[model samples]
Structures are given as C-alpha cells and as structure tokens.
Target: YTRVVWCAVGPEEQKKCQQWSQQSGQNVTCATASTTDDCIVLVLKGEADALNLDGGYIYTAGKCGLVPVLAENRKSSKHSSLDCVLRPTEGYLAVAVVKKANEGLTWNSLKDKKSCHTAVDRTAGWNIPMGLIVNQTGSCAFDEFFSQSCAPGADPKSRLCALCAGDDQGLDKCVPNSKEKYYGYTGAFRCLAEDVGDVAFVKNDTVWENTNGESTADWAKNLKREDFRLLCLDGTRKPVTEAQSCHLAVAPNHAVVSRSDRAAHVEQVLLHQQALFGKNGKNCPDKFCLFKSETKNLLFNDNTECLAKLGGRPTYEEYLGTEYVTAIANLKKCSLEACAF
Candidate 1:
C-alpha cells in the first residue's frame, strides 16, 4: 500500500520506470502520462505518488500544493568532501550562446536576431532569458524581438515558430515535445550550430557536453568549442568556460515532487531505493542502476549523482529563490499580451 507510484512522461520514460519497478521488487510502480502536466494531474488525483520535475514545473506543481521531496544532484564540478546525498545542490547555469563569427553580436545587440530556445516555460531556455528581455525592453513584445525562433510550445503560426523544423519528417512543427527537430538543449544548440539562429539559450554544461567531440551526435559531430562564445550580461562576450561569471542566472535543480500528504513516504522509499540502485549502491553494477538510462535521462537526469536531501523542508517559494520567482512572475504578465504559457 505504501508503494510509490512514479508518473512517467511519455512511453520511453514509462519503459524505463517499469524496469526500475521490477528491479526494486515493485517498491515503485509506473503511471503513464502523455505530458508533464498530465503527470502532475495524476499526482494531484492520487493516481500517482511522485515525479521528478524541472524548476518551471516545480512552480506549476507547487502552486497546486505539491511539495518537493528530493533534488537531483549531479557530479560537482568543484570538489566536495561530502557524499552526494549529503551535499547541497548547486544549481545549473543558464547561458546565451552565439557563434564567435557573429561579430558585434553581444547581449546588447540581440534585438531582431534569430534565436533558439529549449521550450516555453523552461528556465534557461525561456523564463530566465525572456524575463530579462522583457524587463530590459520594458515591453512584452519578446516575440517581435526575435526575427525568427524555434521556441516550441509557442503558437505554430506565430513568428516564434518560424524556425522550428518539426521532426525528421516535418510533421510536428513547433510542438513542445522532442518530436520537434529543434526542441531541447541539443536541438537549440544545433539551431545555432547550423546557423538557423543567431543565438541559442541553453545551459553551460550543454556547451561542454556537445562541443569538441564530447558528443558524437551527427549535428554536433564537427563542432569546435573555439567557434562559440557566451553572451555576458555586461554586454561583453566570453569563452564558454567563463560561464561561472557570465551566465544569465543559476537555475534551481530539478527535483522529485509529491502531494504533501505523501511526501514523507515518497522520500523514505526513494532514499532506500537509491541506496540499492543508486550510483554506487550495492546492487547497482550487478543488478541494476537507477541513474543510468541509456543516456535518455528517463526518470532522473542522466547526469544525476543521487537524490540529495534538502537542507530544510523549504516552501516552494523558498526553494526556487525569491529573485527567480519574481522573474517568473514578471514574465507571466505577458500572458495578457497573448504569450503562450
């Protein structure tokens, strides 16, 4: 009866969760959903116990009274003596990247340039960057700011979708899901790499993960790190390695969320389950590993080290940070200006 039901977004994640269910002796089970919002609805209706979500979804879920249980802690870039589960999470960096060959294209000159985004409502890809743009421009005309873009989830007929190439067959143009050719981090980066967009909004690690042969994806196969630069907030450009000082913002890490009533149970089960199937768990290498999912980042991000504990039981507002929450709040006003959620 205490078994935790994980809400999986789409079939691939459902298949991965099913494997985890079997390996854990059914300690956790899968509940399928076509989208993250549907998964959140399942949790709300008590059909599922929990699901890990990005910070933007955290805001949406938290607004509906769900509470965060554990955060995804990835391998620390800086050395830490404490174990992953015991250490605090340092959020990922949000960055604006552009081709180094785009001379004079700084943050100050982005208006009317082509842009690429992971999706609408996402942190690094949408909220942080667009919020800053709206605030700076003092207008909610962000759609007009970009000459063309591949911001999935925007109206397909809008200029925002002008650059979205859809899937390999060109069927789901501008759709928010992975089916869109230029969808998430890699897709957005590919938009810039292929010169479809003048700039791309993505995270710092995305740059390092795909450039200079770190990734062999056909689109990124011949990309050189030296050919790109990060647009700093101060109207200057810097190497991708300077993300520590040049990023747009530090986004909160994705985390597991469940209804407040089920939070404790979900936490307990996840902790024990990770101890068995987590990074270095006793049964990980031989039996199964929960963190690895053939690089698809199934239930948890592929880079996750462990499901780390929160310092205190923080409210959603506290967890996401005041500034970020405010920025999101500011951008939501654009909804009145016909912006898509």
Candidate 2:
C-alpha cells in the first residue's frame, strides 16, 4: 500500500514541495497553519510528515514547545531530524513555514497557493532552483490595458472615381468594364504588342498599316472583326461580311484582344521562371512593376489569344519571335503574387 505524507511550508515553497513529491514516489499533501510547533505535534502523531509554520516555531520549541533540540543545525539536532523523517525505503515530504524571513522576489511566481510545504526526496537528489515573487495581476496590466489605434477607413466610391479618372494607383483600374475588362488587367498594351508582333506576318484579306511603318495584314488575319461587330452592333443578326466590317471598325482599340494573348504567354513564362527561381521575392527585381506588367500582359494576351483562335489561327506563338520572348523574360519577380497566402 502507498502512504501519503503531509508537510507545510511557506507559500513560496509550495511548488518545490509538489515537485519533490512527484519525484519521490510518494503521495503528498500540505496545509497552512498558525504555528510550526502545532504543526510539528501533528507530524509526531503521524498526521503530517513535517510542520511548516513561522520561524518562531523553532524558538517556541526551544522554550515551551514539546520537541526541543540542542542546536538548530542538522548535525546537533540529528536525533530530532531522524525522528521527523517519516518513511524507511520510501521517501518523505517536508514542510517548513518560513516566517518573516524574507526570501527575495523572483521572476516566476510560486506554483501552489493552497500548500505552504516544500517537498524533498532523499533517494533521487533534487535542489530548488531560486525562488521568485511575481505579481500576477501586474503582469497582465501591460498586456490587456494598452490601447490600440484603429486603421483608417477608406472611401470606396472616391477611390473608384479616382481609378476611373486614370489614377494609376486607384482601385478602379482593377474593376472590369465588362467581361472584356478582365483581360485589361494583364497589360493589354504589351499583350497586344506581342500578339500583333507574333501574327504581324500572317496572310489575310484585310490590309491595315500601323504607325510603326509596318503593314499588319498577318496580324489582322487572327482578328475577328465579326466579334467586335457583334459587340458593337448589340448582337444583331447581320451578315457575316457586315459583322467582319463592324469588327474592323474598332480594331485600333483592340487592347483586350492583344493583352489577353500576351498575358497567357507571360503567365506561362512566369510559372516556369518561378519554378526555376523559387517562390522567394528575391527572384524578381521590381515586384510591383513586374506584377502590374505581367497582369496587363495576361489580359492583353487573353484577348489576343481569343482573337487569334476565333480568327482561325491554331496558336499564339505562330508569329512571335525569340527576341520578344527574351525581352519579356527579363521583367521583375513581384512578391505581390508570390506571397499571396
């Protein structure tokens, strides 16, 4: 059968007592009392292993108390110490109620509040690391009492207006004008440039001259003038010839067509680049500009790819050159897209 020993010590030593009990292979309990002498009487009766009352208990026992000793030292009071030791093979728990004798404060607070005992094991050696007195309530004041400022509110409508008014940084630039506006985010201009560059030499019936002194019949071959005509004419049941002509009407402002195709190619390139360089932001130089440029490219490439596929070309790279690929691959690796999570 297992035996339990009770010891009483100061509130500061309660944690030590519990730890000692756990290590000593004994069940232990503790209590606080008015006097160490009274606690010692309880120990002698096998009610407790040791008494932890005030330091005055030592003085009282020397005067009128039941148990008296030659000296306070363990060597001189070996008989008293042996008498107090509770078990033989099994370890015993000790309690000592320290009086006004102040052990200095510690960073960590004492563990047990209910018990005043500090336990010790005779078999497996252990030592109390230093004692600390911490103000538990005071520690929480700095954490909970501090005030935090709220974030500034933004005017969504005003931001949208600014974006619509060509504020490049404004949020409106992100909103789609239609489904077609989705392609605009992919750098429609650059995509258009790449798409037009790729299909610039294709054979087509329509002849259009560009400001760059190039005749773009090949580029026009993949463009669906009929689609634009359909959008412009409000889905009218017009002849395919008229629809083609209508589509040609808005060919100059075909930013969506151009960007979407380029964007797709750029996205593919970026994915490959990311695989090579890793997702770290260090891979890309000017992240913000690269993201903006890539996104715009994606939109433009999407439009161009749609235009080309609809206009009858099998693929986007059918007319693009190695030089264009080299130029676009040199852009920045932006963390905006990489660190999204």
Candidate 3:
C-alpha cells in the first residue's frame, strides 16, 4: 500500500508526523525535510507527496512542476475589482464583509456606518480600502463616512476606534496593541462578528478561519462565513468562493503544494483527512485535531481551516490565474530574470 509522503523537520517532528500517520491509519508517512526548498525537491523527485508552503515558494514550486492542491480561504480581501475605473495597476484583494441583515449598504457609500479593520498599516484592513476612500474624500474623513469605526490606528479621539470594545475589561478600547484585543486581521473581523461594529474590512479568509468555532478567540468561537456576504465595489454580493468574480483586489495568500502528477489524488486524500481532524471534523474541539499553531505546523499552516480547491483548478498558472500570475511574475523579472551568473 502506498503511504502519503509527508516531509518533516528533525527527529522530534519526525515522530510527531508518525503520530499523524498512525492516526490516519498509517496512510501518511514522515519524510525528513529540513526546509521548504528541500521539501520542494523531495516532492518534485517523487520522494514526498505533500508539504505546506508559503507564497514566496509558490512560484518556484509551480516552475518546478508542482501544483497548489489547496488554498486557505479567508475573509481577508485585496484582489477584487481593483482594475475598475481607477487603476493602481497592482494590489492585494481587499473586500468589505457585512452581516446578511444589512442589505442597503454598498461600496459606493458608507456614510454614518460603523467599520472594523485588521489593524494599522494592514493591506486588506487599512491600506487599500482606506487609501481608496481617502483619495476620494480628501480628508481623514473616515470619521465622516463611518460614523464609528474600530480602525486600530486612528486617533483615540476619532470614531475609527469608537466601536472597539477593547480587551479584558474594556480597558484599552482604542489602544493599538495586540493586548488591545480588536487589533489585526482576526481581531478586526472579530470586532465585526461580535456585533461591536456593523462592517469588517479584512482578508476574505477571516470569516472562514474564525467561524464554526475554528478560532480560539472568545468572540469568534461561533462565527461563520455563511453569516456574512462580500460587498463588492459594484454593490453585488457573493459567497466567499465566488470572490473571483465579485472581489475588491487580488492579493496573495498562503497555499498547500503537491506533485503535479498527484494533484488530484492528494486532494481527495487530504480532504478525507481534513474531514477527520479539522476544526469541525470528526475529531475536533476535543479529540484529534488537524489545524494547529507554531509548534504544531508539522504538515500544514496552523491557521488553515480547510484545504479547499485552488479555484477548482489544477496546475500553477491556471490556479494563480492571469491577474495574480502577472503580479508575481513582475516581481520575479525584477529579481530573477535580470539576474547575472
């Protein structure tokens, strides 16, 4: 019987992966791989079947004949209708998410509404969307559009943080620190999920990662992407998966990789394991678990909720799509193609 070749670092982790193999009824086996590049080589040469990877390595993996079998879906947005009338030319996808009850609001207007953000200087949270608004409004008039907001970086006197409930005992309502609670991607999304704010501007994966009790945060322990809708620039709404058509910008996110030849097979097997140990899986919130933290990132990223299809696509370019390929390719040309031996 063929076993899933799962690469790991060091012996301790090698042993940890062993547990996963046993837990999966010995379907997955640990293959020692000290680094991402090493794992890439192992998978390419048919020595390993799968490994979790970062965006930086995606292009390289794609170039080497590997495929992104899965992608992390988040409420975080950057790549949507960025090429609309105006043209920053390049940007990450930034989307506006809202509860189903709020049907009147759209991108063209946000006057007197409440807002939430991932944190200061965040692309999906603060940069792209806020910059778009400020460029149009001509003032820190977020206070004007959003009657109250939990934009982590705004002045304490401003309404940006007006909706913030703060950490512990509401002590740091508008403070710009992790301890302040309503801070980053998950934080801003949490601000919206808890009814503390009306809208949350974050990555598309935010709703997926935190809801269904996937997140450990008290506020997000019971959230779900289904409870929200993506508010597109054109005012249309869609499910998180339909973002390819109704999105704000198209920024990159983390991904999972596999041998090009085994892309489909790995997908089925991985999906099977996910259904077993994932947050909402057969063994979760109590028994065996798949999603984990730093020390637990043996086979995959800890924050991952589920390994959904890469746009129901296979292969790299087809998966990254044209817009994303051009964006990442530009970076490669600047550093790789122009390089001299």
Candidate 4:
C-alpha cells in the first residue's frame, strides 16, 4: 500500500489537494505547508512525494537533493503532431518589455528605471532578468539598480515594492501571492500596460496573451500588441514578434520534483493521475480537472497541456540546463539570503 503524499502550499492549495486526495480514493494524500519553501522541506523530510516547482524553486530543492520527475508542457504554438505527453518541454522565452512609445529606453539605459517582475525568485520574472543585470554590471546590488519596482516578495517598504498595488482594498501590497495586484505574469504585464513601471520582466507569452484582445480583463482588454517593444541585450529594440531573436533568456520549464528515492513512484503515479484528470483525461471537465484550479494555479499551471516525459532521467542541474544553472548560481552570490534559501 504505497501512497503518494503531495505537498500543498497555502490554504487554497490545501483545499485543492484534499479534493484530489478524495478523488484518488486515498491513493494520494496531502501535507500542507505555508510556502513553497516549506513544501520543499516537507518533501525533503519524506512527508511528501512530489510537488511541481518553478525553475527557481527547483534550484533550491535540487540543492537539497531532490530529483526532477516530469515537466509541465503547455500548448505549443509551433506546429507539431507529437502528443503533448511525448513532446519535449520547450522552455519559455524571458524578455524585458517596455512601451513602444518610450522610444529612448533600451537595455543600456535601464539603470534607475522603474521595473515590474512576476515575483522575486521566479525564472522569467526575477532570476533571468536580475541574473543578466548582475552579470552585465558585475554588481550584486540589484535592489539598487531599479529606481523602483513592483517586484512582489521584496520588503514591502522597499523601492522594489514601491509600485505594487494591493488588492481591491489596497492591503497586502508587495505580498508574493495574487493578493498583490501587480503579482505574477498577468499582473506584472498589467503593471507595464498601465504605465506604472517603465519595464516589465516577464515571458514573451505573457505579452501575447494579455494584448490584442486576447485577455478581456478591464486593464488588458484594450491593450494593443503593437504598443510594446522588447529590449534586446545588444541595446536594440524589437517588436514582440521578434522575441525569438531578442529575448533575455530561454528559461527552463517548471517540473515536478521529489526525493531521488520517490522519483520513479512520483513519475508513475503522476502519469496515471494525469491520464485520468489531465487536459484531455477521461475524467476531466465532468469529473475533476487536475490542472484546473478555481484559484490561480494551485498545483499545476492552468495552461499545462500535460506532464510530459523527460528525454532522460536527468539530474537537477542537467534538467535546469548549464547556462541557466550558471546564471542562477552567479545571481545567488549577489545575496546571502538567496544562497541560504
């Protein structure tokens, strides 16, 4: 009677995990944690079998001896006949975006400019952008590089949190969760769209999804795709369509992580579970959608097409890729807190 114990971060996720647990007929169980870090700790203690994590969190968990299981694959824009579960994980494109009307701003002139980020430790939002910035400038003071920002997870009273607007009531400003209005991909893009920040560090997909009538939210409904420009490392600006050529980095996709001993079991159970509750699963929509969440992205991203198999049972460093691992390592030296965490 082996059972997979999943770690749930925060109460919303706990509720979702309990639902999944019941749906799985006790084949799975829940171990609740207050944060992603806490969840990692639970997994490390062997109280949990697996949890999906951003590349940033993967770095942290991997350092504590976790192994990658399966990658979260999203709908591929590129035409391909491969089934989603068999397809390779295409890493997302990280980009620095600015208003097309802000004609003079380029990568070289970004110093002291206001910025927006999805969150402090996320790949596209914080790690890739800040890693590049720290490398280019050979400085560790990334906090001082931006004049102000809406980067959630920074000290609430710091410049990094200066632009973040809380929820409808204006409370919990700069908190990492959705309670902070300018948090996550859509929120960070909204920060730039609303002209609250000069630049937004986000993925290329975010720009495409929120503009051109793709997103009907009040703040994004009228956004024009043409109004945004991507900042290239070479100090040149390019249209958003040119992200392939001008992006800051190709970030590794998020993946499920577990202790090396539990890797195989986690992978097996996840494959079977997704078959039942995944995007095209037999029980989805009518019974339960494993990837869908009433709250924004509880266990898996809402956009996840499937948990695709990896090319190999790669080590954490191998899965994250050398260049990105190097970038994250370099950036980690900029703060003792990052290293310790």
Candidate with the greatest TM-score versus the true structure: 1
Between which residue pairs do clashes occur in model 4?
Answer: none
* TM-score (all chains, Cα) for each model: 0.92, 0.17, 0.49, 0.90
Q: Model 1: per-residue lDDT, tens digit, 257-279?
A: 99999999999999999999998
- The Cα RMSD in angstroms, rounded to one decimal, for candidate 3 relative to the true structure is 11.3
Candidates 1 and 2: which is better by lDDT? 1
lDDT of 1: 0.88
C-alpha RMSD by candidate, in order? 2.8, 41.6, 11.3, 2.6
lDDT of 3 by residue, 1-341 (tens): 24678876444457767777888887777788644566678888888888765444566677877778776543224544432112111223567888876777677767677888865444467555666676567665445777888876567777777777666778767654444567666678777777777778876655666777777566665666678888887767777666667666765555678877787777777778878887688876666676664222445545655665554365666655576555455433322432111
Q: Positional deviation of 173 in candidate 4, in angstroms?
A: 2.8
How many pairs of residues in model 3 come into backbone collision? 37
What Cα-based lDDT does every candidate model obtain?
A: 0.88, 0.23, 0.65, 0.88
Clashes of each: 1, 44, 37, 0
User: Compared to the true structure, candidate 1 yields what TM-score?
Assistant: 0.92
- How many Å off is the CA of 335 in candidate 1? 0.9
